[PDB]
Amino acid sequence: HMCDAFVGTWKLVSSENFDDYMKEVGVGFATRKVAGMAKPNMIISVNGDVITIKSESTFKNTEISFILGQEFDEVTADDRKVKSTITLDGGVLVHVQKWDGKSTTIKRKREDDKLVVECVMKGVTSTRVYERA
């Protein structure tokens, strides 16, 4: 029942500062423009200890399955090859991605009826708000 309140199908409804976050990550112009249009469906499910987060989008579909605290390989939507570790900290899913000596942290939280995604690269934060689909 660890991630019960995250499970479901969610649709992106708002984004703030995503272009700057993507710049800080190293995403190039064309990918930033096309990625920034997308309104993905995020599908979260749990089976035993395995959490799956899928993103269905007009830009790029992605899928990760993981066990909390156990590092895994991830190919991000912008085609970075990262090493990811996801933990639960006070009810927040905390996702750290490492690649090329860089790091970004993505936090996912339930707030009211929304799922709020905060993406941080150095001093730059983007906030992406999802509602139930």
Ligand SMILES: Cc1ccc(C(=O)CC(C)(C)CC(=O)O)cc1Br
């Ligand atoms: C270029 C690009 C396109 C999409 C995404 C994501 O959707 C994942 C995050 C950042 C975690 C945001 C979210 O899930 O809404 C990331 C990058 Br970089």
